[PDB]
Amino acid sequence: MLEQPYLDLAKKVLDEGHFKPDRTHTGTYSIFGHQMRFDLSKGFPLLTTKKVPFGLIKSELLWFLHGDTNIRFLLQHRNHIWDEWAFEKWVKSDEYHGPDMTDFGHRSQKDPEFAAVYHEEMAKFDDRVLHDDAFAAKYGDLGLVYGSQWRAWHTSKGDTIDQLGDVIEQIKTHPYSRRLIVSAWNPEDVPTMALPPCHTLYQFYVNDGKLSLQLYQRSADIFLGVPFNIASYALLTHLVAHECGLEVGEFIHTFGDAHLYVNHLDQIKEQLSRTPRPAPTLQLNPDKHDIFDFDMKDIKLLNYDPYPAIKAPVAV
Amino acid sequence: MLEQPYLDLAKKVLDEGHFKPDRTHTGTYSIFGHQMRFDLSKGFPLLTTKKVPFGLIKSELLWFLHGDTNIRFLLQHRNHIWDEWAFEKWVKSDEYHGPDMTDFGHRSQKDPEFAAVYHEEMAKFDDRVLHDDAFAAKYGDLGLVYGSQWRAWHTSKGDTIDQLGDVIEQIKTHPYSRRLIVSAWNPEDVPTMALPPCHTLYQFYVNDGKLSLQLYQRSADIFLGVPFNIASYALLTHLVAHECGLEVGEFIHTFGDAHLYVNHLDQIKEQLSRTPRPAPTLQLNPDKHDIFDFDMKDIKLLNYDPYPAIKAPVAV
Numbered sequence: 001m002l003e004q005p006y007l008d009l010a011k012k013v014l015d016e017g018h019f020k021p022d023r024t025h026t027g028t029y030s031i032f033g034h035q036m037r038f039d040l041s042k043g044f045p046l047l048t049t050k051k052v053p054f055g056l057i058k059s060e061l062l063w064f065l066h067g068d069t070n071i072r073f074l075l076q077h078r079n080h081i082w083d084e085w086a087f088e089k090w091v092k093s094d095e096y097h098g099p100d101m102t103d104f105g106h107r108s109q110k111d112p113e114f115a116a117v118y119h120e121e122m123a124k125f126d127d128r129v130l131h132d133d134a135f136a137a138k139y140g141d142l143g144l145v146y147g148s149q150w151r152a153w154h155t156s157k158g159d160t161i162d163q164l165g166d167v168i169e170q171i172k173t174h175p176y177s178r179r180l181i182v183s184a185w186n187p188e189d190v191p192t193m194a195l196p197p198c199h200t201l202y203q204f205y206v207n208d209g210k211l212s213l214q215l216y217q218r219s220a221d222i223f224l225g226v227p228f229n230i231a232s233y234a235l236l237t238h239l240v241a242h243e244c245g246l247e248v249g250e251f252i253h254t255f256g257d258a259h260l261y262v263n264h265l266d267q268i269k270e271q272l273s274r275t276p277r278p279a280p281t282l283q284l285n286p287d288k289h290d291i292f293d294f295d296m297k298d299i300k301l302l303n304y305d306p307y308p309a310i311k312a313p314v315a316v
Numbered sequence: 317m318l319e320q321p322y323l324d325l326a327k328k329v330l331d332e333g334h335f336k337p338d339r340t341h342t343g344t345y346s347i348f349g350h351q352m353r354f355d356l357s358k359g360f361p362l363l364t365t366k367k368v369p370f371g372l373i374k375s376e377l378l379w380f381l382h383g384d385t386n387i388r389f390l391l392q393h394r395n396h397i398w399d400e401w402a403f404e405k406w407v408k409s410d411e412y413h414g415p416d417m418t419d420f421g422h423r424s425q426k427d428p429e430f431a432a433v434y435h436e437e438m439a440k441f442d443d444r445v446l447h448d449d450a451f452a453a454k455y456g457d458l459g460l461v462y463g464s465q466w467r468a469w470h471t472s473k474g475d476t477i478d479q480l481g482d483v484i485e486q487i488k489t490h491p492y493s494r495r496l497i498v499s500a501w502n503p504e505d506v507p508t509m510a511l512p513p514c515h516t517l518y519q520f521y522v523n524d525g526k527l528s529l530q531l532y533q534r535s536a537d538i539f540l541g542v543p544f545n546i547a548s549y550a551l552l553t554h555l556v557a558h559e560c561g562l563e564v565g566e567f568i569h570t571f572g573d574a575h576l577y578v579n580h581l582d583q584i585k586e587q588l589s590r591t592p593r594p595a596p597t598l599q600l601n602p603d604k605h606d607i608f609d610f611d612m613k614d615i616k617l618l619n620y621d622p623y624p625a626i627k628a629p630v631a632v
């Protein structure tokens with residue numbers, strides 16, 4: 001039933017992959033060369049074998065689609081996924097002169113001053129991100145994130161081109177235009193960067209009413225990693241299919257280094273013994289038909305019963 | 317045996333694809349979502365069922381790898397594939413004041429002043445591209461082609477970053493670096509363009525000695541189109557595997573709008589009745605170990621016996 005290419009993609013990786021050592025230095029079992037499909041009329045490819053949370057995919061998303069980059073907002077919509085990049089900023093800070101969080105993620109596991117106290121050096125950084133907007137502005141803002149790669153490309157001439165907005169009007173002016181891609185890989189910015197964009201480029205189609213998507217993820221982690229990467233870019237197919245009064249066909253998923261990080265070997269084994277406890281339905285409000293302003297409760301995902309949720313250590 | 321994912325990929329397209337009308341306006345039978353692999357120790361995925369010519373893939377290539385864009389050279393190495401873009405320039409020309417080639421490709425089929433006379437308006441353009449270098453310089457130069465996207469990205473600051481050169485030194489400094497891609501999609505240049513780059517981005521790996529490639533072709537034509545697109549980017553895997561003293565594993569091929577243009581329906585049917593008359597061997601000279609200067613005869617492809625060669629009309 002729907003999420004099964006991810007269940008079928010993890011099975012292949014863990015006996016049959018090749019161990020490959022990553023930077024974090026706790027290897028993998030990987031492939032490279034993988035392509036995966038979902039058909040969104042058989043609903044949402046949201047993972048019933050463990051619990052994936054939707055709220056926090058849905059919040060992430062809109063943030064990107066608003067041409068935003070200020071974590072300030074992720075916090076308001078109760079989100080904190082992108083936190084630690086702005087923190088890596090404030091603890092190496094010019095003006096957080098005092099109680100340092102040096103090496104804090106690969107020393108979460110190790111605790112004792114990072115234990116709570118870094119996680120709450122962090123939340124306190126966070127409130128100034130929420131009240132001294134001088135600190136949202138000048139700290140919660142990661143700059144070159146997907147919302148500035150998809151809606152604010154900085155051009156050879158100082159300003160911005162909005163790229164997911166031409167997906168939306170070209171889907172609409174010439175439909176079955178073979179060129180309908182947005183790249184977020186920006187050559188001249190990958191080296192000074194911390195994570196260049198995992199989700200490099202995604203190609204659109206307008207099939208025949210069916211809006212169909214395909215994402216090119218060069219890096220990919222099966223387990224924590226890929227469950228949120230099926231469900232942000234299938235929600236894009238729904239949103240966009242709806243934006244030009246077209247109707248969802250299918251989301252496809254190209255991979256690079258498809259990987260199941262050696263470290264979380266036995267919790268993936270743990271999932272492939274839960275049987276895909278049916279499929280959710282995303283509905284999105286008929287009355288709002290943009291995609292760019294969507295407050296949170298217009299896109300709603302009906303009927304989820306997941307399995308209980310399976311848990312990781314320290315990501316890096 | 318080796319080229320069979322292309323033979324298997326065309327069979328699926330022509331009964332089972334969906335007709336989709338392109339700009340040229342002679343539709344298709346297409347898919348979208350396709351991923352294809354080749355393993356280059358079982359030699360070269362060069363097409364024995366019809367005849368593909370190698371010389372002219374090999375010349376094309378080096379041109380791109382020299383950071384070049386002047387058709388002047390393609391001509392010298394007896395190549396004329398990229399011609400008509402510089403001609404579309406010289407017949408709409410400020411200073412080809414007289415004998416016009418208005419609409420010339422979608423009116424090759426139709427002939428009579430384009431018949432020979434445009435093809436030889438063309439070759440004459442060409443000689444000035446070869447002798448009045450003022451005309452190579454200011455006419456044979458397409459500018460933003462793959463050699464300036466792979467080796468000369470124009471940055472938000474006037475100059476160039478050389479991107480296939482960091483594939484070559486990063487493959488080499490940190491090997492199993494998950495980020496090893498070159499994009500040629502340049503957002504802010506796709507609209508003023510004629511063909512934005514079909515071969516958008518390609519990802520590297522360094523498997524374990526095996527250099528492995530994957531190309532992201534958004535558009536793709538099975539028949540004329542895709543045969544040259546298997547064999548330029550597998551030759552890149554050989555060249556690059558050899559450049560950092562690594563050894564070829566495999567080239568993979570991601571597609572977008574995988575297509576068999578309706579127009580050449582019965583010559584593809586014609587191929588899938590030739591049985592894959594074994595496999596060539598590319599050898600490349602031990603003595604040259606760069607990839608950037610390669611004159612033509614260092615990369616040599618041994619033992620080809622193709623089927624006779626099957627032929628198209630007017631591409632556009």
Ligand SMILES: Nc1nc(=O)c2c([nH]1)NCC(CNc1ccc(C(=O)N[C@@H](CCC(=O)O)C(=O)O)cc1)=N2
Pocket residue numbers: 081082195221223224225226227228261310311312313315316
């Ligand atoms: N290995 C890897 N996987 C990633 O998910 C990840 C990474 N590396 N480093 C950079 C990055 C940052 N994006 C992300 C992705 C997920 C979360 C997150 O909060 N959710 C995890 C939690 C699972 C658990 O710990 O129980 C997830 O499932 O994705 C945070 C930031 N993504």
Ligand SMILES: Nc1nc(=O)c2c([nH]1)NCC(CNc1ccc(C(=O)N[C@@H](CCC(=O)O)C(=O)O)cc1)=N2
Pocket residue numbers: 397398511537539540541542543544577626627628629631632
């Ligand atoms: N449909 C399509 N296919 C393409 O090959 C093509 C296109 N469109 N338009 C832009 C473009 C330009 N690149 C190319 C590709 C191939 C040739 C070429 O000389 N070789 C063909 C010839 C086959 C025949 O006519 O008998 C080939 O097989 O690719 C020229 C320019 N590529």
Ligand SMILES: Cc1cn([C@@H]2C[C@H](O)[C@@H](COP(=O)(O)O)O2)c(=O)[nH]c1=O
Pocket residue numbers: 023195196198199219220221225226229494495
């Ligand atoms: C932001 C992002 C990163 N990642 C990952 C997985 C990798 O193990 C981690 C570091 O990868 P990298 O070294 O290829 O950049 O980033 C995802 O899986 N999804 C995401 O959206």
Ligand SMILES: Cc1cn([C@@H]2C[C@H](O)[C@@H](COP(=O)(O)O)O2)c(=O)[nH]c1=O
Pocket residue numbers: 178179339511512514515535536537541542545
């Ligand atoms: C330059 C290039 C174009 N093409 C194609 C196939 C398409 O039918 C033609 C026009 O496509 P487009 O409208 O998607 O740009 O360009 C290739 O197949 N290979 C190439 O390398």
